[PDB]
């Protein structure tokens, strides 16, 4: 029942700083070190450093000296990491993890905090319905699409028919273009299913507080 609760996602501008938190529970906080680990998909997993909660003594990976500062509030069982002078290279998921000493494993991890470092502005998506060419389908199944263009930051959530249509769905990872994100999704149903039944692409973008529910209609 050891739990490490980390703060939520962050979007910051290049050159700024960010401070993230990790609140521990379910054990004596001062008996273990708290660690931070970076997950990027250009450098995989890297250990940043550790901190002794009783006295605040820190040990850093030299690669993160200057970049990261570890602090603790032992009264609230909370560990903090401040990341400074931010660049796009710092965009990553950061984890807190405890060990009893560095020769021992990271036996419990936080859920991770996602950091986005970018100059792009928070922007709601355009959501475009993709109906088959006005001459489809020519078979037993029909494929429909949803194109979610020009949003920032990640993530969006996408469902079909509010999640009721979950089989036959492919939702593709978002890609940057004109450094805004674009994502697409497809759904395949029997030809007897559409257009006789309504199919709707439901897109939510938490960062812009926007939801779009786009019905896929036959092309004119």
């Amino acid at each position: 029942e050891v739990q490490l609760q980390q703060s939520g996602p962050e979007l910051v501008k290049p050159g700024a700083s960010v401070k993230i938190s990790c609140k521990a529970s379910g054990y004596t906080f001062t008996d273990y070190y708290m660690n931070w680990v970076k997950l990027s998909h250009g450098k995989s997993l890297e250990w940043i450093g550790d901190i002794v909660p009783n006295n605040g003594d820190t040990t850093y990976n030299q690669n993160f000296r200057g970049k990261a500062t570890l602090t603790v509030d032992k009264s609230s069982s909370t560990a903090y990491m401040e990341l400074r002078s931010l660049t796009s290279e710092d965009s990553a998921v950061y984890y807190c993890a405890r060990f009893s000493n560095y020769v021992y494993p990271f036996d419990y991890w936080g859920q991770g905090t996602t950091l986005t470092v970018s100059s792009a502005k928070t922007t709601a998506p355009s959501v475009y319905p993709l109906a088959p060419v006005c001459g489809d389908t020519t078979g037993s199944s029909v494929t429909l699409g949803c194109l979610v263009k020009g949003y920032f930051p990640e993530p969006v959530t996408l469902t079909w028919n509010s999640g009721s249509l979950s089989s036959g769905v492919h939702t593709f990872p978002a890609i940057l273009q004109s450094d805004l994100y674009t994502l697409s999704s497809s759904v395949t149903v029997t030809s007897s299913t559409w257009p006789s039944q309504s199919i709707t692409c439901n897109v939510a973008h938490p960062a812009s507080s926007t939801k779009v529910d786009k019905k896929i209609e036959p092309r004119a």
Binding site: E46, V103, F106, Q111, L147, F172, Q177, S184, S186, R219
Partner: protein
């Protein structure tokens, strides 16, 4: 520092197979070697520590072996929930360092892609943009090639491709290819074609439309 190397970055197996993942250290780390499991939801769990010890609550199908500079994680009978990415990590000397990860995937029979092409929506056209979308769906194995024709001429600029992870239900892959054009450019050409090349055929699968027939 100590470099941890996982020479295989992605390994394919069948459910029920005995799967072994290799880890090597650039110098002797004794038995201070741990293994972690990472899943798409971001969850990271300890599996094995100190080379061979099983973490509390980890299934007995997981085991660990090795010493010095050569280590391995074995799954004695692969289960669906084991499809994930595995990282080794040394704790002999600071700074602590991890391998680059080994992703497990499932084998299945080869499957041709189902290809569908989509002209710009009328809504996107009113907005001043034009994206042409091609889905290449439910194919296996994962490697595939898409080629866009515009009035015959191959277009690679403005093309962005995205692959799904392996489908949890049928073990296939899918890919979306999007050709982005200004609306002016889209209305100055007529024939739009996307071609799928996959090991399942020496012939490309071709889908096409004429902008507004």
């Amino acid at each position: 520092d100590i470099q941890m190397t996982q020479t295989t970055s992605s390994l394919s197996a069948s459910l029920g197979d005995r799967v072994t993942i290799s880890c090597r250290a650039s110098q002797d780390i004794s038995n201070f070697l741990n293994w972690y499991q990472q899943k798409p939801d971001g969850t990271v769990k300890l599996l094995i520590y100190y080379t061979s010890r099983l973490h509390s609550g980890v299934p007995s199908r997981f085991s660990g072996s090795g010493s010095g500079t050569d280590f391995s994680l074995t799954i004695s009978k692969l289960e669906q929930e084991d499809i994930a990415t595995y990282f080794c990590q040394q704790g002999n000397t600071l700074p602590l360092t991890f391998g680059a990860g080994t992703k497990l995937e499932l084998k299945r029979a080869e499957a041709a892609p189902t290809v569908s092409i989509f002209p710009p929506s009328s809504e996107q056209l009113t907005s001043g943009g034009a994206s042409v979308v091609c889905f290449l769906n439910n194919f296996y194995p994962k490697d595939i090639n898409v080629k866009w024709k515009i009035d015959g001429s191959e277009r690679q600029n403005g093309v962005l491709n995205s692959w799904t992870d392996q489908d949890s239900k049928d073990s296939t892959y899918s890919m979306s290819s999007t050709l982005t054009l200004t609306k002016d450019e889209y209305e100055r050409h007529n024939s739009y074609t996307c071609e799928a090349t996959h090991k399942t055929s020496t012939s490309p699968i071709v889908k096409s439309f004429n902008r507004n027939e």
